[PDB]
């Protein structure tokens, strides 16, 4: 899995360019209160998993994301709602056929993340208990990535680990570093960025090939100001939370409407990446012996896949 491509269940692409990619990561299952799976459309799920096999490529679950890791903490603490999380997380690998699951708690014991997120100082022991209960459950063949924010899951006072239990390494497959929404959107260069990201996370114990460098299609507007027409203000799910705006402008608004040194991204104020930044990110991947680079997402990019086509130099 070079190079991975998320879709989203809201808003599938219409038609996948299969053979420029290697890795589809479907998102989200959003995990209850009560280790349930919820959030997704299962006739939707069904056929991207169909179409992904007859076209030879692989498919995985994303658990959780921006909106759903509420409950994550609470779930995985506890023991007989972590039994049942694991217990359908491995039911959902069995219903859909699938070849991973991609794990997207943002963030374990954060302050960062969704303001009213379960959050325990033992959040990143117990995600790991997850883990290793994953790959116990699974098999092997089974693909067991996580999304990762750009430093080592946080420790037990809310502070990015410097070592890491290398049963993360040895049980997860791929640690796809989410290195945007950084302020320059998506920085390759930096107090964090893309570089630090797999500075910080190799030296917590992640070999090199299991990380793989998260790039987005789209970029954030700075004056928080609206982005274009897919930048609906959304309040998070806490009572009484405040609805506002994310600053989003897809590849496509960039496209059709139609540089920064440091971090090797270019500026318009709306930063964002084209073919040449991603390029720079692809050789970063490169010459730093990386797994691959993932993508958020899918649907953004064009009718000529610019930024897909951007990015094959890592397949
Ligand atoms: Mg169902
Ligand atoms: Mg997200």
Redesign the pocket.
Known sequence: QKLSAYVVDWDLPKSIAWDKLDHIVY?FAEPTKDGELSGFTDSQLKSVVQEAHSRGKSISLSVG??TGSLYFSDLLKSSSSFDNFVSNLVDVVKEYDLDGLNL?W?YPNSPNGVACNSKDENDTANYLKLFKALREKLGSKTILTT?VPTAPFNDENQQPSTKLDDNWASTVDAFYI?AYDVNANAPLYYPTSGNDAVKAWIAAGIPAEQLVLGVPFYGRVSKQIKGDSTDEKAADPCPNAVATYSGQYIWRTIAQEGWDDISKTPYAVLSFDDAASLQDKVDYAKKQGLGGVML?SLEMDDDENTLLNALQDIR
Do not use: Q, R, S, T
């Open positions: 998102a994301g921006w997207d943002e999304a989410m958020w």
